[PDB]
Design a binder for these strands. Structure first.
Ligand code: MG
Ligand code: MG
Ligand code: MG
Ligand code: MG
Ligand code: MG
Ligand code: MG
Ligand code: MG
Ligand code: MG
Ligand code: MG
Ligand code: MG
Ligand code: MG
Ligand code: MG
Ligand code: MG
Ligand code: MG
Ligand code: MG
Ligand code: MG
Ligand code: MG
Ligand code: MG
Ligand code: MG
Ligand code: MG
Ligand code: MG
Ligand code: MG
Ligand code: MG
Ligand code: MG
Ligand code: MG
Ligand code: MG
Ligand code: MG
Ligand code: MG
Ligand code: MG
Ligand code: MG
Ligand code: MG
Ligand code: MG
Ligand code: MG
Ligand code: MG
Ligand code: MG
Ligand code: MG
Ligand code: MG
Ligand code: MG
Ligand code: MG
Ligand code: MG
Ligand code: MG
Ligand code: MG
Ligand code: MG
Ligand code: MG
Ligand code: MG
Ligand code: MG
Ligand code: MG
Ligand code: MG
Ligand code: MG
Ligand code: MG
Ligand code: MG
Ligand code: MG
Ligand code: MG
Ligand code: MG
Ligand code: MG
Ligand code: MG
Ligand code: MG
Ligand code: MG
Ligand code: MG
Ligand code: MG
Ligand code: MG
Ligand code: MG
Ligand code: MG
Ligand code: MG
Ligand code: MG
Ligand code: MG
Ligand code: MG
Ligand code: MG
Ligand code: MG
Ligand code: MG
Ligand code: MG
Ligand code: MG
Ligand code: MG
Ligand code: MG
Ligand code: MG
Ligand code: MG
Ligand code: MG
Ligand code: MG
Ligand code: MG
Ligand code: MG
Ligand code: MG
Ligand code: MG
Ligand code: MG
Ligand code: MG
Ligand code: MG
Ligand code: MG
Ligand code: MG
Ligand code: MG
Ligand code: MG
Ligand code: MG
Ligand code: MG
Lengths: 158, 217, 173, 62
RNA sequence: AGACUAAUCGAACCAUCUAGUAGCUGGUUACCGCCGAAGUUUCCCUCAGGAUAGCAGUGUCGACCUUCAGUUUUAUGAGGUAAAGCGAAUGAUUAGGGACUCGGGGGCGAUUUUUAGCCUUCAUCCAUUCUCAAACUUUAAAUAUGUAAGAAGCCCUUGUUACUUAACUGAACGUGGGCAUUCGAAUGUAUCGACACUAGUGGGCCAUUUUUGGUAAGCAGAACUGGCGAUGCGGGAUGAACCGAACGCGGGGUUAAGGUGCCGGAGUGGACGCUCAUCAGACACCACAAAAGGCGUUAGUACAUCUUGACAGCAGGACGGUGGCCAUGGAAGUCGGAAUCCGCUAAGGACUGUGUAACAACUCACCUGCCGAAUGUACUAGCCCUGAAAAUGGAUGGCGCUCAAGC
RNA sequence: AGGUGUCCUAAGGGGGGCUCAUGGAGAACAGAAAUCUCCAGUAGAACAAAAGGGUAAAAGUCCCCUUGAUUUUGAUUUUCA
RNA sequence: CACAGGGAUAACUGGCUUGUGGCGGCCAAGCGUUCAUAGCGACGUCGCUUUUUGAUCCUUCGAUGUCGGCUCUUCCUAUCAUACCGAAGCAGAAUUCGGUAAGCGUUGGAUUGUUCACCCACUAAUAGGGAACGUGAGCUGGGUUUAGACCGUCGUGAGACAGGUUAGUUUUACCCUACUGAUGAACUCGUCGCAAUGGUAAUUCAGCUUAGUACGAGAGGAACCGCUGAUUCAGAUAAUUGGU
C-alpha cells in the first residue's frame, strides 16, 4: 500500500483514443480576468503546472493572473468542515465554463423585456416556473382507428 | 487429490485465467472438441439438437470429457462413424486454487493455521449461465431419435439441471430452415469448407460476380 | 379477486416530427381502474417502445356482459411461469358471464398448479358458439341430454350456537 | 492479541451532528498570493485617487 | 542433597527508611428535574496505556439580522464500474476451405534430377468459424458528485498610478448618473452567527445490497446506510440485534405486526379445488435435506389410430406357381450359402417359432364374424410416496385434528 | 504481481538538421545473419532502472556552443492536527 | 523459583464447520466361456455420520483433578451368532447378496504401562460404538508431568532434548437431593378380600433316532417330529458330602 502524487491516475490523465499528438493552438489565445469562472481538466501531455488529481473536474474562481498561469480558488471538504484552497494551474489545463452563461443570458433578456412592457403597461410574469400538469384537449379517431393488441404465446428461439 | 466436485460448484470468485501472473497451472483434461465427420457439407446435415444449461454454476474439465466420450460411443454405434458431427461448445478457462494444509504446513511445521492461506492452482473449470448451449449435434432427419437419446444419456455426468431443445435453424447456420432454403435458390449462398458465405452487395462489382455467378442473371 | 372488464386506450406523446401517433387498445381484467391502467403499461412495454413517462391515456371504459342471464361455455388461452420454464395451456369453463371465468380460472390455476397472479398472462377468451367444439371431458358430461341427478347424504344446517341437541339428526334432506 | 484495523462506520453521522459549516463569503477578498509587481503599483494608484477626491471640495470639480 | 543454621533457607530473625512504586485486580455512602456520548483520525520501545482532532455539557455575547438546508426542479462540467466487444489493437483458443514450392518432411515416372514434373504432411498467407480476460479494450449506463440561479446585480459617462501598450490603448480600485409598478425556480425555516472553559470515550458487536482470503464455519477482513451496546412495550411458545412501535400519572374511542376448535381475548365463518402418508402435513429471519425413480392421483403439450368402426376378449380361415435357384445317405419355409416374383382373393410370408431322416402336423403373421366409442406412444409440473441410519423419555409450544383445526 | 537505500559534466540547459522497429525487391567473395540502393512503414523502436502515463520537422537521434545542478528571502499543493 | 494480572491468549470436554477419515447411493464403457446389471463396476457425479485428524478461540486461569486397566448399570443399529423368510452362474453339502428384527448372548491365556496390535486354545459366535473421548471424597499409581541420580548427541559455560534409564506423600461427607431398605399423625379397634398403576425372564448347544436315506456318474452327504442330557442366567433350600 502506497500513496504517491499520481497514484491511481491510469485512465484519468491519459489522452483519449485518436487524440494524441498536437495540442490545438487556440488554447493559448484565450484571456482571463479575476472573478471569472473556470473549470480544471488536466492534459496529460503537459507535465508542468499540473494540479493534484483531486481537482480534476472541479470548478473555481480566478484570483490571480501571471505570465502563463492563473490562480484558482476551490473549496475542499475535509470531514465536518470546508477549507479554502488556492492552486496554481497552467492555462493548458483550465477552460472557461458555461455554468453561469444561462444566468448572464437571462438577466440581459429580462431587462429589455421588462422595459418594453413598462412603456406599454402590461404585467409580464417574467420569473420562471416548473412544468405544470397538462390541460384538457380532444383527440379525434378520423383515419386513425385504434389497433388491438394482445400478449404473445411462448416460443423457443434457438 | 481431486476433491469431490461438491466443493467447487458455485461461481464465487472473479475469473482467474492462466497468465503471466499465475504460473504452473496443470494442463486441462479435455483436448478434442469436434468428433465425427467434421467436414461434411452444410446440405448434408439439416437437423440440429442442443443441450442447454439451466443453472448458473461451474462445470469441471473432467466432467466435460466424460460426457464427450459417453455421447460419442452411442452415436458411433447406432448412427455410424460418418453419420453425424458433434461439437462441444464450452471451454474451461477458470483456474481453481487449493490450500494444502498438510503438504505445505505439515511434518516440518513451518507456519500452520490460516496464516498465509493463499492457495496453489489445482484444476480448470468452465463457467456457464442460464440458457447457455453446452453440446451441439447435427445429423440427418432420419436420426432424430438417436440424437435425442445420445444427449439424454450424457447429462448424468453433469451437476445441476439441463434441457434438450431441437433447434429450428438449418444445421449450425443462424438462419431459419425456410429462410435458408429460399435464399439458396436465389444464388446468394456459396459453398465453403463445411460452412457457407453470403452475398452482401456492398463492395466492388467485379469479383462479387465471379464469386456468386448465379446471383446475376 | 372480484374483477370486471375494461378497455383502455393509450398513445405516445405527440412530437413535432410525429404528430398524431398511433392508438392502441387492450382488454384488461382488473379489480379497479387504478390497477387497470397499471396493467396496460405493463403489457405495452413488451410490444412497443413506449413508457408511462413518455405516453398518455386517452380513454378507459367498462364493458358489461350482454346477456348475464344465459348459460354458455368459454375457452381460455394462457401462458404462465412454473418453477422452471414457461408453458402454454387451454382450459374451459361453464358459466353465465365473461368476468367470472377469469375469476374461476385464477382460482383454478392457483390450486392445481400453484400459480400466483404475478405469473399468468391471458391471451384470448372466446365463447364457444356450438356444442361440438367442446373438447375437455369434464364439460361434455354437463351438456348431456336430459340431465338430472339426486343429492345423497347432505348434512342439515344447525345453528352454531345451539349445542346439546336432544335427538339424532337425519341426512335425507 | 489481534484487533480491528480501521473503520469509517460512524464518521458521517458524527460530521453532520451539528452541520457541515461552509465559510462565509465576503465582499473584499484578501490580496495574499497576488504577484508583487501588480501589488506595488496598486498601492501608488490608490494613494493618488484619495488625494484627488479629497481636493474635490476646493479643486478639480470633475 | 542447594543440604543445615530455633516448626522459617536458591541467602535467617527483629526495628527503622516506609503510608516504598504499580500503564494491573477490588470497592467508592440521600432524593427529584433538564440535556445526553464514544470504541474513529495523526504521532509515541506504542498494541491492557497516554497526547491530538471529533462526538457532549454548561456560561454567555452579536442581531431578532430574514439568514439558512444530509431535499427537488432548470442550465452546464468531470468519471471508466455493471453490461457489452473479439469477421477491432495486445493476450488466450477450436475447426474445415482456397492459394501457393522451393520453408521443413516423406515419395513417385529412370530415389534419373536444379524435373517450379507428378504425390502429399506440417509451416505460411488470405476470406470465413466455436468459446474467454481482477492486473485487456474501440464503445458505455443506473446510483452517487463540482459549479450557478443577481442589489456585493446589470448599464452609461470619466479621475488616479512608479504596472502594461506604438499609443489615455488596457488593467485593477473609484466620483457622478441611469434601471423596482414585478429584487427575478419549488418547499421548509419546531431553531442564525461567533467565542470561552471542561467531562467521559479511544477492546466494540449484528443485519439487507456490493465484496476479498478459505472446502467450509455461530471463522478472519472492508464500503454506503439502519440498529444493539445506552431500551422498556405488543407479536415470532422461549431468545441483546428480526416484524410493529420508542415511554410523565389516569379515563373513553380506533388500529399496527400477529391472530379467532380448546389451553386464550375473537369464527368449529363464506366461495372453488388439491392431498390418505404401517416417517402425512402445518408460516419470513429459524433451527435442515439432495441426485435419481413410481401404471398413486390431478391438470397440461405434441404426434399417430378410429363410426369406411379401431383398442381388449372370444370365434372363422390361414390358399397356387414351387420340394424356387444352390447345397444333399437325407434339409419339401424353418442345417447352411446367396436372391425376394407372381396367381387367386377381403385377406395368408419364396415365413417368426415349434416340429419330421426327410414330408407331414402345429403356431404366428395377415384378413373375416360379435359388440358399441373411443384408443396408442413419448414428454411437462402440482400434492403424495421410495431414496431417509445414533446413542436418558419428548416435543408443528401442548392437547388433538382427515369434504381439517392440512396446502 | 513487482520495486527503492543507487546511477549521470551529461544521461543537466539552448539551438539546427534528420526519422525509427520491421517487411518486399535488388548488388563480386557474402551464406539465416556483415556493407550499399530504392519503395512501403501511426510508433508495433528509443528515452539509466520496477510498473503505468506521455512524446514524430520530438521529449528519440547526430552535430555546435555552454554550466539556471548559481545568489536573496516569502506565498502555495500532496501525506496532514 | 517468586509477584501483579489475563479466559483480550494456548494444552482436555462441550458448541459451529466436515477438507481429510468412515459409511451409503445414481449413470453404465467393460469383466463374468455365451450375456451391461447372479455377483462386480472404470471415466464422472449427488449425500449422510461425528467413535479419526485438522481449522476456529465463544464458555472456564480468586482451579470443572489431566493416560490405561479393574468394577457396575443402561442406551444406539451401520447385524458376528440365534428365530422366520426372498434371490444365485442355489443338484446335495459348504458358501455369497438382501428384508423384518437390538428379545438374548459375544470368552480363557503368552509379550507390552499401553489404547492399538500380534500369535496359542475353546466356542452357536468370539460384531462395531455412545453416556463431560461414562466411571480417582470408588480403587490402583505401571506410564506421563516438580525437586535426587546415570548415559549418548548439542552448548565456551550455567544448562537444553514430543531420546533412553532408576527412586518418588493420592486429603474431607454427619449437610440438601437421588437411590436401597425401615417407622408413621388424622377418620373407634380389628379380621377376611378386590386390583388402578409400576416391575417382568429365561438362554444356547450336543448325543441317539430319522439315515449312509433324499440328492449325485462318482466322490460325497442333509432336514421336520419323537427321546435323553448339558452350557450361561434366575429364585429357593440343608436329608446327605465338604468348609468353618
Ligand atoms: Mg491507492
Ligand atoms: Mg481522460
Ligand atoms: Mg522537473
Ligand atoms: Mg469424503
Ligand atoms: Mg473468494
Ligand atoms: Mg482499537
Ligand atoms: Mg450509531
Ligand atoms: Mg540440583
Ligand atoms: Mg527464632
Ligand atoms: Mg529448620
Ligand atoms: Mg541474607
Ligand atoms: Mg521488617
Ligand atoms: Mg495510600
Ligand atoms: Mg504499602
Ligand atoms: Mg429524564
Ligand atoms: Mg433526550
Ligand atoms: Mg496486542
Ligand atoms: Mg480490563
Ligand atoms: Mg455544543
Ligand atoms: Mg474499465
Ligand atoms: Mg479502475
Ligand atoms: Mg464484465
Ligand atoms: Mg462494446
Ligand atoms: Mg482479441
Ligand atoms: Mg488474436
Ligand atoms: Mg489450414
Ligand atoms: Mg475492467
Ligand atoms: Mg449534475
Ligand atoms: Mg490507541
Ligand atoms: Mg483523549
Ligand atoms: Mg472485542
Ligand atoms: Mg481500555
Ligand atoms: Mg446471537
Ligand atoms: Mg467480522
Ligand atoms: Mg473475533
Ligand atoms: Mg429498540
Ligand atoms: Mg417479547
Ligand atoms: Mg419459533
Ligand atoms: Mg381464518
Ligand atoms: Mg375464547
Ligand atoms: Mg367452516
Ligand atoms: Mg392406503
Ligand atoms: Mg406424477
Ligand atoms: Mg391426461
Ligand atoms: Mg381386434
Ligand atoms: Mg417425505
Ligand atoms: Mg406432535
Ligand atoms: Mg409433526
Ligand atoms: Mg401455533
Ligand atoms: Mg372446502
Ligand atoms: Mg390456531
Ligand atoms: Mg385455507
Ligand atoms: Mg508484495
Ligand atoms: Mg545536452
Ligand atoms: Mg536538446
Ligand atoms: Mg531539436
Ligand atoms: Mg506507450
Ligand atoms: Mg491514511
Ligand atoms: Mg475467549
Ligand atoms: Mg465429510
Ligand atoms: Mg463382453
Ligand atoms: Mg446394482
Ligand atoms: Mg468411483
Ligand atoms: Mg471435530
Ligand atoms: Mg480453548
Ligand atoms: Mg483454567
Ligand atoms: Mg470456578
Ligand atoms: Mg467435580
Ligand atoms: Mg488388563
Ligand atoms: Mg436395519
Ligand atoms: Mg441377514
Ligand atoms: Mg436389552
Ligand atoms: Mg489376565
Ligand atoms: Mg466423542
Ligand atoms: Mg473420561
Ligand atoms: Mg483421589
Ligand atoms: Mg481415569
Ligand atoms: Mg467421581
Ligand atoms: Mg511411578
Ligand atoms: Mg526428576
Ligand atoms: Mg527444598
Ligand atoms: Mg562439550
Ligand atoms: Mg527426558
Ligand atoms: Mg519411572
Ligand atoms: Mg526409596
Ligand atoms: Mg461415607
Ligand atoms: Mg442311487
Ligand atoms: Mg461313503
Ligand atoms: Mg449339520
Ligand atoms: Mg443361591
Ligand atoms: Mg461335617
Amino acid at each position: 500500500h502506497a500513496a504517491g502524487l499520481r497514484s491511481g491516475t491510469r485512465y484519468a490523465f491519459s489522452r483519449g483514443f485518436r487524440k494524441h499528438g498536437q495540442i490545438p493552438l487556440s488554447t493559448y489565445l484565450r484571456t482571463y480576468r479575476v472573478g471569472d469562472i473556470v473549470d480544471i481538466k488536466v492534459n496529460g501531455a503537459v507535465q508542468k503546472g499540473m494540479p493534484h488529481k483531486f481537482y480534476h473536474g472541479k470548478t473555481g474562481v480566478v484570483y490571480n493572473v501571471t505570465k502563463s498561469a492563473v490562480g484558482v480558488i476551490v473549496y475542499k471538504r475535509v470531514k465536518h468542515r470546508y477549507i479554502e484552497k488556492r492552486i496554481n494551474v497552467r492555462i493548458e489545463h483550465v477552460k472557461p465554463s458555461r455554468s453561469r452563461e444561462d444566468f448572464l443570458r437571462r438577466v440581459k433578456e429580462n431587462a429589455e423585456l421588462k422595459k418594453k412592457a413598462k412603456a406599454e403597461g402590461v404585467p409580464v410574469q417574467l420569473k420562471r416556473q416548473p412544468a405544470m400538469p397538462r390541460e384538457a384537449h380532444t383527440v379525434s379517431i378520423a383515419d386513425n382507428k385504434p389497433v388491438t393488441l394482445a400478449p404473445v404465446a411462448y416460443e423457443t428461439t434457438i | 487429490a481431486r476433491r469431490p466436485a461438491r466443493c467447487y460448484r458455485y461461481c464465487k470468485n472473479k475469473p482467474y485465467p492462466k497468465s503471466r501472473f499465475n504460473r504452473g497451472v496443470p494442463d486441462p483434461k479435455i483436448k478434442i472438441y469436434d468428433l465425427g465427420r467434421k467436414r461434411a457439407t452444410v446440405d448434408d446435415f439439416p437437423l440440429c439438437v442442443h443441450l442447454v444449461s439451466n443453472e448458473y454454476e461451474q462445470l469441471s474439465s473432467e466432467a466435460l470429457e466424460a460426457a464427450r466420450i459417453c455421447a460419442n460411443k452411442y452415436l458411433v454405434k447406432y448412427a455410424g462413424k460418418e453419420g453425424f458431427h458433434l461439437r462441444v461448445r464450452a471451454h474451461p478457462y477458470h483456474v481453481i486454487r487449493i490450500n494444502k494444509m498438510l503438504s505445505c504446513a505439515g511434518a516440518d511445521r513451518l507456519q500452520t493455521g490460516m496464516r498465509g492461506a493463499f492457495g496453489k492452482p489445482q484444476g480448470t473449470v468452465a463457467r456457464v449461465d442460464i440458457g447457455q448451449i453446452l453440446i451441439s449435434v447435427r445429423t440427418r432427419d432420419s436420426n432424430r431419435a438417436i440424437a435425442l437419446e445420445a444427449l439424454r444419456r450424457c447429462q448424468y455426468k453433469f451437476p445441476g439441471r439441463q434441457k434438450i431443445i431441437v433447434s429450428k435453424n438449418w444445421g449450425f447456420t443462424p438462419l431459419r430452415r425456410e429462410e435458408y432454403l429460399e435464399k439458396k435458390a436465389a444464388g446468394r449462398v456459396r459453398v465453403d469448407g463445411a460452412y457457407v458465405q453470403f452475398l452482401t452487395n456492398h463492395g466492388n462489382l467485379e469479383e462479387n460476380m465471379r464469386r456468386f455467378p448465379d446471383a446475376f442473371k | 379477486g372480484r374483477l370486471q372488464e375494461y378497455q383502455v386506450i393509450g398513445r405516445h406523446l405527440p412530437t413535432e416530427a410525429n404528430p398524431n401517433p398511433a392508438l392502441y387498445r387492450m382488454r384488461i381484467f382488473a379489480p379497479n381502474e387504478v390497477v387497470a391502467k397499471s396493467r396496460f403499461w405493463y403489457f405495452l412495454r413488451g410490444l412497443k417502445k413506449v413508457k408511462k413517462a413518455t405516453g398518455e391515456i386517452v380513454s378507459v371504459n367498462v364493458i358489461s356482459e350482454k346477456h348475464p342471464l344465459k348459460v354458455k361455455n368459454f375457452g381460455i388461452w394462457l401462458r404462465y411461469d412454473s418453477r422452471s420454464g414457461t408453458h402454454n395451456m387451454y382450459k374451459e369453463y361453464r358459466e353465465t358471464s365473461r368476468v367470472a371465468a377469469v375469476e374461476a380460472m385464477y382460482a383454478d390455476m392457483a390450486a392445481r398448479h400453484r400459480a400466483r397472479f404475478r405469473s399468468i398472462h391471458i391471451l384470448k377468451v372466446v365463447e364457444l358458439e356450438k356444442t361440438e367444439d367442446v373438447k375437455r371431458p369434464y364439460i361434455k358430461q354437463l351438456v348431456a341430454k336430459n340431465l338430472s341427478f339426486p343429492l345423497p347424504h347432505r348434512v342439515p344446517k344447525i345453528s352454531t350456537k345451539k349445542i346439546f341437541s336432544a335427538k339424532r339428526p337425519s341426512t335425507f334432506s | 492479541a489481534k484487533s480491528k484495523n480501521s473503520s469509517q462506520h460512524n464518521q458521517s453521522r458524527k460530521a453532520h451532528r451539528n452541520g457541515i459549516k461552509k465559510p462565509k463569503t465576503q465582499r473584499y477578498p484578501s490580496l495574499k498570493g497576488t504577484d508583487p509587481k501588480f501589488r506595488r503599483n496598486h498601492r501608488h494608484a490608490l494613494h493618488g485617487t484619495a488625494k484627488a477626491l479629497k481636493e474635490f471640495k476646493e479643486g478639480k470639480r470633475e
